[PDB]
Subunit: 276 residues, 4 copies
Amino acid sequence: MIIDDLLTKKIIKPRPLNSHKGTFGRVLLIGGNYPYGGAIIMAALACVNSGAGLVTVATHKDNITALHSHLPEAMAFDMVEKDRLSEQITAADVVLMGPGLAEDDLAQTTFDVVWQAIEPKQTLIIDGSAINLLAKRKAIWPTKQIILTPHQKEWERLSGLTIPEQIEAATQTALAHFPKETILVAKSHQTKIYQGQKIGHIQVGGPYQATGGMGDTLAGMIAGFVAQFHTDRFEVAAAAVFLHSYIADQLSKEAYVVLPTRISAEITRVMKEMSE
Amino acid sequence: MIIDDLLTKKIIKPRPLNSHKGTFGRVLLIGGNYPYGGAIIMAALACVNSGAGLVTVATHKDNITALHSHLPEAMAFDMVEKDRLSEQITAADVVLMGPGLAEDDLAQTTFDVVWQAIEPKQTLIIDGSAINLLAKRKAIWPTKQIILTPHQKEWERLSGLTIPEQIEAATQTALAHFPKETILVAKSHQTKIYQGQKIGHIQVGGPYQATGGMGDTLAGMIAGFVAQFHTDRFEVAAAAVFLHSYIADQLSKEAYVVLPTRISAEITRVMKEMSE
Amino acid sequence: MIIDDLLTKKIIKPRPLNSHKGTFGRVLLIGGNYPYGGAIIMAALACVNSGAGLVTVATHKDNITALHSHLPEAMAFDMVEKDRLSEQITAADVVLMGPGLAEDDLAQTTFDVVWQAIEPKQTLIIDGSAINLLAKRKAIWPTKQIILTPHQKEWERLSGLTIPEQIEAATQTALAHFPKETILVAKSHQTKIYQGQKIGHIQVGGPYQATGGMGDTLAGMIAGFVAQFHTDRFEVAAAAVFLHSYIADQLSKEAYVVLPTRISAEITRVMKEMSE
Amino acid sequence: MIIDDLLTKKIIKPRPLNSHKGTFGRVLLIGGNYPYGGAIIMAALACVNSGAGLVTVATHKDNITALHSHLPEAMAFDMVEKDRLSEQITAADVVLMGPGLAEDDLAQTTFDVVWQAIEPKQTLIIDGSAINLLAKRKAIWPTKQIILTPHQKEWERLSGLTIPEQIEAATQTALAHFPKETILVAKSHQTKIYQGQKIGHIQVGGPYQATGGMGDTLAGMIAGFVAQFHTDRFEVAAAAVFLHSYIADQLSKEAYVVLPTRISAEITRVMKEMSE
Ligand SMILES: [K+]
Ligand SMILES: [K+]
Ligand SMILES: [K+]
Ligand SMILES: [K+]
């Protein structure tokens, strides 16, 4: 099936007048480990602009200033602070780990803190280098509400499929190995969304998106969507994926390359349009 | 009674041609203690944009750079610098303490410095976590010109009323326990302004405001209003509260969520309109 | 005499096609000493936007990041670096010392470095707290091309005149004590420009300018003007002073307060208009 | 021959729909050594905005925050980190070394790391102070795809020609001393592009460009062009040079000075127009 605007218009519902906060969810982002700070800033920017009720960032000490230059709306702390990181996991509804996390000792220590602190009611998004980190180890998943957002090569690491042999049928079968509800966002030329026996295709998107930080922005948007829209999780993530490229398509008419932060700036205006 | 634009148009008076500075007041903001830096940046942004003559921020050493990235208009120093903090209290007309202050040892040391340095002619706004700090201790108030801006839960801590039993009559009676002139801004779904036997209701506002940092922006605006408008303090704070949501209402027509910093950017253009 | 647009249109000449750089001058700014960093950032912003060929800032180590967040166009270094500060003085055509300099030991050490390194062909602008620093000491001036930009109170310190007795005749007579070519910019409600027996009045300006950082922006603009326009120095500084308030007047139609950084952003568009 | 829009329209081709990333190249920038941080930020800004697929910056530790304030899209690390700098050279298609590099011990250590790590398939741009660094030493070039972007004075250092005797014929003959494919961009009043027996002249450009950071922006643009357009390297660099001044010409109609960062902001909109 094809993910289009009508699906996205189905998900992006006008906000209930009464319910204020909580309803719109709390996300914790974990990443931007040296030297990949910008990645967590771009996911943060996307997440806030998508309408997450509260956004909290666990990042490198020396990257907090730059984050706040862009986004004072998001609390940020040193990810090495083990007890605060723990407290913040329990306060979060959605945990996005991976953008700019890297693979050093601090990343593995952190991965393992998060992995032991995740609760069953929480949504866990595993992005970028955290896919490699998930691959090195294994048996019980701390939640069933798992979203994977790997690159062509990172998904290879997790599933054992080379880029030529990452055909729909092969990716689909490698998924039946993770919990049934697991959503996979196969970031690619044409990104596809997998869950169980469902495959979603986006027709929107173009070469103006082939620029550094595009995936981080996508990760942030998916996190913001799942935080506030509690209906079918596959369609919610699918909508996030559609809108990301749909905005890029709009910005392309007047831009040779569409920059990740330029897409983030446009998010609410377009979500507003999508809500009618 | 209902706080509307006509009241706000009554407060926001065209500026006297002669009187330059001083008239528009000096505010000291104290907060943005690690890791809640963004909060003091958002209150600062609101305070300057509301037209405070001079804005000074006592904040965490490592948060000054980020503040100045947004706002070189505001002097900022390390709140641990006891003698400078003291000097700055005596130079201020309005002291806004609390947004991002936190509750650690540095926050309590600071609370107590401010509390002993406040003078009777000064307006004191106690926000966020400083409400909890005020709650732990008590007998003489250093000023009668007190404004409280607590969340549903923080006001519980101060008054002993649960969120179900924070009914108008109960909040009103719990106020008769603080000095007669004390203004309470009950930040809520529908924020209400209390002083003595007066209750102000705003009809403006919506769910697009249910995003992190919204209260900090409100605290900054109230501080900027009270700094420059010296008529009835209840109506001045009420106007600040109205305009905050009124701007959010305007920005909502083209935004699914209205971000705290987006509201700040619009303040003077709208105050200009309000002044006619 | 009155400083108006016709004078400003006389100074702001269309740029010669051939002459590229050098012609437009090199300014060194010295200030933004802790905790007054924003001041040097606002003077820097004004100076670059006014069209200075090259702008260099000697500032506090911990303030360079914030400066570059606003203005990567300007080189910045630690003012404690004595040998680099010296080298940079000799490379500069115009030295603006004072905005946010403060009065501590580092400020006095620096004042005295600059004072001994100034050359006769250089223009020296002494601003803010550097007026107090000039007041404490005295006999030979390192240049005759001196511009003073003090506040009502700072000029008192230098001349011995109280704010009531800073009447035109008294200020004029206190100037005949500094070298003949010295220009005084008496920043006030209505700023006036003094040199010898000349007094310039600006009619433009309003109460929307009574906000923190307004003087720093003026200091930066004067520095940028004198760097590139080598005709009569009194009229050049006068034009800078006029345009500062003229821009504020334009921005006031849609702004209750006009912020110093908002004026800086508009400078070249308006200078372009002034050049015809 | 004259470099105009028709040449630039020939180079800036609409992006292939399929090919996503890699095609658009990876650039490593090395510079922004203390205190010339802004220079690498301005080259970075230009490089990303020109459409480089991935941009990585090797810069001073204390300059990474400021870079990310402007550009979270670009990874940045401490250039003193020898093993990471090495790894990043091998991952890059284009290496731009020099803007703000300075000439101290750290710059020479770095120059020599890069010089030994460059591979034959890589394009190497030597800018600003790195021209002086290239001049001090000499015999085998690590690549034939060399672009030199020196100032009037830096090219003197390399070739032994004074500014009066840097006549077309003299510059042309001094080039026959570097590998045959070497491109020289003679940044000047009227910048000219040299390769072999070819000389390109731009007619666009004006005095509004005579402002600090203009060359850094040019260096960044050339880097972004060569990263994505793999046809004739002389024409590709020529186009980059044309567009830089062409944009400045457009911005000049409403700007007395055209600032380097203002040009960068406009790049994709204009490249989009150039692609038709
Ligand atoms: K809808
Ligand atoms: K009015
Ligand atoms: K003119
Ligand atoms: K074309």
